[PDB]
Every structure is written in structure tokens, then in C-alpha cells.
Design a protein around this ligand. Structure first.
Ligand SMILES: CCCCCCCCCCCCCCCCCC(=O)O
Length: 293
């Protein structure tokens, strides 16, 4: 029996965490740059979105989890004899992974025969949730840790997020915009269609109208799924401030792609991503079914 751990960027539902025994190590958010609140623990996802929606000039800051936060979780499981597997947001967005690496080392000092595996998921939000869920599936289906790890690279390489946001303001201010900043996207009124793959974000298209942008998101995903064998993928949706739009989007996804969503890994996009996307991200994530690899 493994104790699966993730940082809070994965956005897995309360229900999922209880059902599959996944433990979350929270990132923090600050609105004034002085006081920080642990994601989901000291503040709720809905409250954070509200602060941003109420104040379009407010740019909050995120902070990686402390080494001690990871260490206390690792330690409590390890002294019970549990092997630990810990997933983090992509190292290209956050130093979360390296906090966990330092925390593993800390715990080893006091428990030299401890089994702790730290994984740079190379994902975020929906695809981090999809990857964790593939791992949860493999272990529940009776694969050994080694058998599951032998599929990890291919799973991570196959993951994609296809999404759009309300503006470039938060991405630029938060420093992770990277290749999504171009001459075209810098023009007044334009929003990007964004693709997350291989641990980072890139530009998949542009537009101006919310509904047209969501249609472009779907067309970009459809091309990828068609190329790679749609039947062999799990598909889930992530939504931001407007839950109704999210549910309606899920219908468009199922209709356009001719799939049924895996609802367990649908996510209300969390604070970690929202601080950087703004309160209006919407999109879908996909990942290969391990069985097909
Ligand atoms: C369907 C899901 C759509 C939302 C996808 C958003 C994923 C990529 C957007 C960029 C996210 C940057 C997050 C950086 C978090 C930094 C945390 C920290 O301070 O260490």
C-alpha cells in the first residue's frame, strides 16, 4: 500500500482525495505580498476567485510549499512504514518539486530505510490530476510500483491541456507566460488558445470572442486526439469562476469530440493556476490510458 501525495496544483476534488487516499501538500497565495494563506486550508478556492473578480487590478502571488510542509507529511507516513509517492506541478512553473526533493533528504536523515519517490509530473491542474489518477488506477489494478513507473514517461509525454483564458495580464505579471507572449497575442483584445505539453505552455491559436475561442480550443484538441487515437485517451474538463459555463462546456466537449468525460478528474481549476491565468480559464486535459501503452 502506497501513500500517494501531491501538491495542491493538481486540483483533485475533495471526493477524489477521500475515495483514493491522496494527501495534498498546499501551495500558498497572498493578496498583499505580506500575508500568505495555504491553498484550500487557510482560504478557499471560491473566495480567491472572488477577490480577483471583484478587483481586476489585483494581482495575487503564489508561493511554493515549504520544505518543512512536505517533510512533515513524508515523515508521518514513513514512521508508519508506508512507502510514499509524491507528485508535484511541473518544475518549469514552480520550485515545488525541489522543495519535495529537499524534504525527502531531510526525512532520510531520521529514517534512513524510508521509501520516498518524488515525481516532477510535468503537468498542472487537470493533467496533473489525470496523471495521478492513472497512477491510482495502476496500483488499484494490481500493478507493482515498478510496473507503474515503467509507464510513467509515456503517460507524461501523452498528456495535453488545451485551454483559453480571459486576458494575458495574469500570465505576464506572474512570470510564467513564456512562449504564449508573442507579437500577435500582445495586440489589444486578443486572447490565446494555449497548449500545455512537455511540461510547459505554448501558443495553439488566437481569437477575441469567448465562444469562438472555446470552439478553437476544441478544434485543437480534436486534431491531437484524432492523430493519436481518441479511443486510447481519458478526457476531463477544467473550469474557472463560472461553473455554469464549465458544465455547458463539458457538453460541447462530449459532442464535438464524441467522447464521454471521465468525471472523477474534471476539476474546478484551483488557486495555484488561477492566480496565473486570471479567474476565467476554461479547457480540457487528456492523457493516454495506461492499459494501451
Ligand atoms: C483546463 C485547465 C486550464 C488551466 C491550465 C493552466 C495551466 C498553465 C497556465 C500557467 C500556470 C502557471 C502556474 C505557476 C504556479 C507557481 C507556483 C509557485 O509560486 O511556485
Amino acid at each position: 500500500m502506497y501513500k500517494i501525495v501531491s501538491d495542491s496544483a493538481c486540483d483533485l476534488s475533495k471526493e477524489y482525495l477521500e475515495k483514493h487516499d491522496v494527501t495534498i501538500v498546499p501551495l500558498s497565495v497572498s493578496f498583499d505580498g505580506e500575508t500568505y494563506y495555504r491553498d484550500g486550508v487557510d482560504i478557499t478556492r471560491d473566495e480567491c476567485y472572488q477577490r480577483m473578480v471583484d478587483d481586476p487590478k489585483l494581482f495575487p502571488k503564489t508561493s511554493l510549499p515549504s520544505v518543512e510542509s512536505y517533510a512533515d507529511v513524508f515523515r508521518s507516513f514513513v514512521e508508519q512504514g508506508f512507502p510514499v509517492v509524491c507528485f508535484t506541478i511541473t518544475t518549469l512553473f514552480s520550485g515545488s518539486y525541489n522543495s519535495a526533493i529537499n524534504a525527502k533528504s531531510l526525512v532520510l536523515e531520521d529514517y534512513p530505510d524510508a521509501n520516498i519517490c518524488v515525481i516532477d509530473s510535468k503537468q498542472n491542474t487537470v493533467t496533473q490530476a489525470l496523471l495521478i489518477d492513472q497512477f491510482v488506477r495502476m496500483l488499484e489494478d494490481g500493478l507493482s510500483f515498478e510496473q507503474a513507473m515503467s509507464k510513467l514517461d509515456a503517460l507524461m509525454a501523452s498528456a495535453r491541456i488545451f485551454f483559453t483564458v480571459g486576458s494575458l495580464d495574469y500570465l505576464k505579471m506572474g512570470g510564467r507566460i513564456g512562449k504564449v507572449a508573442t507579437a500577435a497575442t500582445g495586440k489589444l483584445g486578443v486572447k490565446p488558445v494555449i497548449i500545455m505539453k512537455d511540461g510547459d505552455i505554448g501558443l495553439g491559436g488566437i481569437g477575441r470572442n469567448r465562444n469562438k475561442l472555446k470552439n478553437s480550443v476544441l478544434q485543437v484538441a480534436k486534431k491531437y486526439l484524432d492523430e493519436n487515437n481518441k479511443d486510447n485517451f481519458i478526457v476531463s474538463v477544467g473550469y474557472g469562476y463560472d461553473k455554469e459555463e464549465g458544465f455547458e462546456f463539458m457538453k460541447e466537449v462530449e459532442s464535438t469530440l464524441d467522447v464521454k468525460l471521465d468525471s472523477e478528474t474534471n476539476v474546478a481549476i484551483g488557486i495555484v493556476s488561477a492566480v496565473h491565468t486570471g479567474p476565467y480559464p476554461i479547457g480540457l486535459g487528456v492523457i493516454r490510458k495506461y492499459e494501451t501503452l
